């Protein structure tokens, strides 16, 4: 599957997105690989407990770590490259983008990084995370 | 009783209020009756009535308020009515006891208060059948506060409510948190990880002995009977 | 310091119970009384209260001392409740009751006690209480 990027004047017009398939038995998992831009996901932090979440979870790296998320939608600009190993592990998956905040300004400013790592790994935690 | 407030007074709290005052009032009420007509005068039955330090504090405890509170008229009426003689009056305010708010205890007793375990408390109350307090409860009616100075505490509901909500709290983050990096771990490392870690356990099955008696070794028995008794008997008989 | 308003004895309890046996039977003798060590301007514990002319209990510090002193007997040398005819209620296991009730055995009075759930486990209970205690 191959992103088309189109532009006119500069700006991009369409994108054209084609997925394509080689018939046969293909054992290239060296060369295999996923450069997926993982959707962005809001955030919105309420109760006490979601920020504990949150400073639980080791990829959410912040500029300032005192910054207050009381009362904040943070947003994810985060894609994944994975190289794969078998079938379904990932012989090692980088799952990095950068942490926004909703200001009252409603401007978008970056505030902390997810520089998530892992080598031999069935698939993304921030993902399970996301789903539930 | 238990949430019990003021809206939902009810059958079971008028029964536990005259368990804890009516009935009470009419077993002194009675014994005072036996003694009289027995004309006992030099032998009054002192009565430890267990008085409390929360008066509507707590809340939501029926009638257990006024149940205990009422008995404190007992140490006026011992003087205007005419059973003075035949009884005696030791109102105990029975501090904290352990043993639903136990977790907490420990909470407390930060703030400079004694909780009491129920065989501490047992021998407080002990104390106030000593000959010298049944001698003093004799002369006047005596207040005994064993509450470990609880009652210094400024308004103990909300303090309660706020060790309740901070142990509760912690204890709900931590098992969420415990959940939710488990969960996380199981996804990155699939189920093959903590499929060798699930251990098989192996439940007994019953096998049902004939308990032959034990046969010790022949040095060992030996040393149970004497010497002589070696070839001595007929084994016959 | 929140009641605030404005002796060591040689034993061998948990390292030798032979010598602390042999020990029960010696009748302590206090010298100095924990009464006379409560803090000045400091409530203890455990108190009594005096009825105040007024028509309130206060602390009194004397009746206070004489009960703490008494506690104090009870301890070192123990208390004896012969001659004592009781009645308990609400002496179910697990209750204060129960406790109290081991005590006055243990001191070697005469106990009623009421039950509300009278049935074998009680009972037997009971009996298991009083070959203990009695």
Redesign the interface.
């Given at each position: 599957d191959v992103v088309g990027t189109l532009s006119r004047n500069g700006k991009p017009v369409m994108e054209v997105t084609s997925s394509f398939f080689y018939r046969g038995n293909y054992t290239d998992f060296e060369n295999t690989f996923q450069k997926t831009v993982e959707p962005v996901y809001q955030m919105h932090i309420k109760t006490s407990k979601d920020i504990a979440v949150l400073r639980s979870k080791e990829w959410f790296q912040l500029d300032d770590e005192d910054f207050d998320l009381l009362n904040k939608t943070l947003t994810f600009e985060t894609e994944t490259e994975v190289t794969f190993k078998n079938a379904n592990i990932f012989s090692s998956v980088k799952c990095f983008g950068p942490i926004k905040v909703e200001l009252p300004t409603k401007e978008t400013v970056e505030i902390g990084i997810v520089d998530y790592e892992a080598g031999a790994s069935h698939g993304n935690p921030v993902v399970d995370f996301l789903k539930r | 009783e238990q949430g019990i407030e003021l809206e939902h007074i009810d059958s079971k709290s008028e029964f536990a209020h005259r368990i804890m005052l009516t009935n009470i009032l009419r077993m002194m009420g009675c014994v005072k009756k036996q003694k009289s007509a027995r004309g006992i005068e030099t032998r009054p039955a002192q009565v430890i009535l267990p008085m409390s330090p929360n008066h509507g504090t707590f809340g939501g405890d029926g009638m257990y308020s006024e149940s205990k509170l009422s008995l404190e008229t007992l140490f006026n009426r011992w003087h205007s009515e005419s059973w003075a003689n035949q009884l005696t009056v030791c109102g105990a305010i029975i501090g904290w006891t352990r043993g639903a708010n136990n977790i907490i205890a420990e909470g407390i007793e930060k703030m400079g208060v004694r909780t009491f375990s129920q065989k501490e408390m047992a021998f407080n109350l002990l104390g106030l059948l000593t000959p010298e307090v049944v001698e003093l409860c004799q002369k006047s009616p005596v207040m005994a506060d064993l509450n470990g100075g609880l009652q210094f505490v400024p308004e103990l509901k909300e303090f309660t409510a706020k060790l309740r909500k901070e142990l509760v709290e912690t204890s709900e983050v931590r098992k969420a948190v415990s959940i939710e990096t488990a969960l996380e771990h199981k996804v990155v490392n699939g189920n093959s990880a903590d499929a060798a870690y699930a251990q098989v356990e192996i439940q007994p099955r019953a096998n049902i002995q004939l308990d032959f008696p034990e046969l010790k070794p022949y040095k060992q028995v030996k040393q149970i009977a004497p010497a002589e008794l070696e070839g001595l008997l007929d084994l016959e008989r | 310091?929140?009641?605030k308003e404005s002796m060591d004895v040689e034993d061998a309890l948990d390292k030798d119970s032979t010598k602390e046996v042999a020990s029960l039977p010696n009748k302590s003798t206090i010298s100095k009384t924990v009464s006379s060590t409560i803090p000045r301007e400091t409530?203890p514990?455990?108190?009594?209260?005096k009825?105040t002319p007024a028509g309130d209990?206060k602390?009194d510090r004397q009746?206070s001392s004489?009960?703490l002193?008494?506690?104090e007997?009870?301890?070192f040398n123990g208390?004896t409740?012969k001659d004592?005819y009781v009645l308990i209620t609400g002496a179910g296991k697990?209750?204060?009751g129960?406790?109290?009730l081991?005590?006055?055995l243990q001191?070697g009075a005469k106990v009623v006690v009421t039950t509300s759930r009278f049935s074998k486990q009680v009972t037997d209970y009971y009996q298991s209480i009083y070959a203990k205690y009695g």
């Open positions: - | - | 310091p929140i009641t409530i514990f455990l108190h009594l209260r009825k209990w602390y009746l004489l009960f002193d008494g506690l007997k009870a301890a208390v409740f004592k697990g209750s204060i129960a406790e109290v081991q005590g006055l001191g």
